[PDB]
Design an enzyme around this catalytic site. Structure first.
Site, PDB file in Angstrom:
ATOM      1  N   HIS A  38       1.504  -1.541  -0.302  1.00  0.00           N
ATOM      2  CA  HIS A  38      -0.393   0.241  -0.102  1.00  0.00           C
ATOM      3  C   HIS A  38       0.690   1.373  -0.149  1.00  0.00           C
ATOM      4  CE1 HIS A  38      -3.945  -1.206   1.772  1.00  0.00           C
ATOM      5  NE2 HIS A  38      -4.398  -2.095   0.758  1.00  0.00           N
ATOM      6  N   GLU A  68      12.112   0.127   0.293  1.00  0.00           N
ATOM      7  CA  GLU A  68      13.025  -0.290   0.619  1.00  0.00           C
ATOM      8  C   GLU A  68      13.424  -1.513  -0.824  1.00  0.00           C
ATOM      9  OE1 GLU A  68       9.643  -2.560   2.465  1.00  0.00           O
ATOM     10  OE2 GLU A  68      10.472  -3.902   2.487  1.00  0.00           O
TER      11      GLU A  68
END
Lengths: 368, 368
Positions: free
Chosen positions: A245, A298
């Site tokens: 999300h 990330e």
């Protein structure tokens, strides 16, 4: 009552440090966008000074020789403990007793020493230290970090870390930033506030695991088999590392500059990483078009850190190294605020009773 | 906007641990009043278990042999760092990955080891350690604390510390308790949360200085010259240590049980301390009858701690030793809550600008 626990949406401070525009898709340190700071090759020492001081006046001084005294086997624990221990030896007074200029100098000295501790802890105890004369051949804090860590650093690997640290320097009032501001609001010394924030940053709830996308990227060998690998991982009921999300309404601008730096520097994994990003993003938005699905920071942080030869167990410490810039900026701002951060609570537990009416009270008398 | 910075009066949690009734003049741990817990000689190990578990089921296990690895010259720094270092050697998983029973066991082990570290750090490095066979002659955590510290403990000095620790175990959502709950809410290990709270507790804004009332009590030799000494200190423009604006609407119930324990145990300073309390309280309410002036808990905490031969630099660590009971109780409660404590902030800083419009940008290019 009629409240939701967790201080969610409760404005706690007003900051002049940075602005994470989540709907505008931008991150600006003191008004300057992070893409400008990275694309112009502005080193981490200047972005540290810009976030803390508010301008490009005076950057970050070099660290002093100081062999790391803590060898716990955890890089986080080593810097957390070693930072707290700096106050006695260096004579750090509480924030109440020092002026603003002294706090700034103490924050810049502890920041640059945390970077030294991480490079030492990463290099390990089974290797002799890099001579200080070799470290002094370089003039930036990041180049000296790589030299103290690897010995002979590669300039392209230094540019990757300078790009990663700048993009990770500050991102609002994270729980670690809140912890640093809380501890600082009690008047404690700056080393006690930095050490406490590191403990909060070590929490796995908020941070992401960059080292978890590397195995998936190792499976895919060419840009072609990316779709099939992403097909198999989703068909095997597993999860796709690096996607979920959205945090920003569009993409994360930090993932923007990290991917751009990986392309500009020529990371070998870039061709496969791009193919995996679209192969992923495509699959997730087809299987569930009801959700806004984006690439997490990330994912490209792993490509950049892995390109700089940063191992898996070292990636969490690399984040902390850059986040010290935002931590010191909020610590010094909290100092000038002058207000103890103290919330409130509501008792909903048992009413007034006698010690005899408590279970196990017999054991208090039997084994008195 | 229309808000006051500092999260003041904002309910952050709902607790079932303890209730500080400020208008009723009472402090109750899980419904049991602290006077009942002290007057019945309930040891600190049981009040730890009552606050954490909620009943008198199973208390506190004894500490294991573990020579303190940190000798920083600051007792706070030694326990702050030594606690963080327990996670690697003892295999403490993050709070996310462990169940409630494991977290409780880890909290009880780290609590009892912090007490061991304080007794070791206080005893000093220039003295050999107390043999473990001597420490094992005693069966309570407090008696073993005094034995590891002093060697041959006096039972009346043990009762004073058991009374002080119980009265200092928990007092609501202090900034250190908040810090512990915040760090725990990120999923970190229990050692990282305890270590961060100690850094917050070290702040001088909230805590009081018990060692500052001892010099005044040393001037007054008999109960008679208390009025004249309090007269001179106020006439010399100084402040009276141990008295100020009320915390509770009446007195602090913690100052109640501390003064009572000092009388019950026969502290030599009790006769002079009482005369100084009334001599003070009288003078302050006559010179400014517009304010509610009461005796702070730090005043009688100093009498109790000094009676137990606790030096000045050790008194702040004695507070932390007892406060670990409330810290572990809130850490385990925060674990069962399952909500990250994350506030919000408002940017009021400079708008979007270019890097060239920032002062000192020339130095970024000159010394690039």
């Amino acid at each position: 009552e009629n409240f939701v626990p967790g201080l969610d949406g409760v404005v706690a401070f007003t900051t002049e440090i940075a602005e994470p525009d989540k709907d505008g898709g931008a991150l600006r340190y003191r008004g300057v966008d992070i893409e400008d700071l990275v694309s112009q090759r502005v080193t981490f020492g200047d972005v540290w000074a810009l976030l803390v001081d508010g301008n490009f006046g005076s950057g970050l001084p070099p660290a002093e020789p100081f062999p790391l005294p803590i060898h716990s086997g955890d890089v986080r624990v080593d810097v957390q403990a070693g930072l707290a221990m700096l106050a006695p030896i260096w004579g750090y007074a509480p924030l109440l007793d020092i002026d603003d200029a002294t706090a700034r100098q103490q924050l810049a000295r502890a920041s640059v020493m945390a970077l030294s501790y991480v490079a030492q802890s990463a290099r390990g105890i089974y290797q002799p230290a890099v001579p200080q004369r070799i470290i002094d051949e370089w003039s930036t804090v990041t180049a000296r970090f790589m030299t103290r860590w690897q010995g002979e650093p590669d300039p392209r690997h230094i540019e990757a870390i300078d790009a990663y640290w700048v993009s990770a320097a500050e991102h609002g009032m994270n729980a670690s930033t809140f912890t640093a501001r809380v501890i600082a609001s009690t008047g404690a010394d700056v080393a006690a506030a930095l050490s406490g924030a590191i403990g909060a940053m070590s929490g796995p709830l908020h941070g992401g695991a960059p080292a978890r996308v590397l195995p998936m990227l190792d499976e895919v060998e060419r840009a072609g088999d990316a779709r099939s690998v992403v097909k198999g991982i989703l068909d095997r009921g597993e999860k796709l590392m690096g996607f979920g999300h959205r945090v920003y309404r569009a993409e994360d601008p930090r993932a923007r500059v990290l991917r751009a730096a990986a392309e500009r520097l020529g990371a070998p994994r870039y061709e496969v990483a791009v193919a995996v990003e679209q192969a992923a993003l495509s699959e997730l938005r087809e299987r569930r078009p009801d959700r806004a699905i984006e690439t997490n920071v990330e994912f490209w942080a792993a490509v950049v850190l892995d390109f700089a030869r940063v191992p898996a167990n070292m990636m969490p410490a690399m984040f902390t190294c850059g986040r010290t810039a935002g931590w010191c900026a909020h610590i010094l701002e909290q100092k000038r605020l002058g207000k103890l951060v103290r919330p409130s609570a509501i008792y909903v537990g048992p009413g007034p009773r006698s010690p005899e009416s408590v279970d196990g009270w017999e054991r208090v008398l039997t084994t008195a």
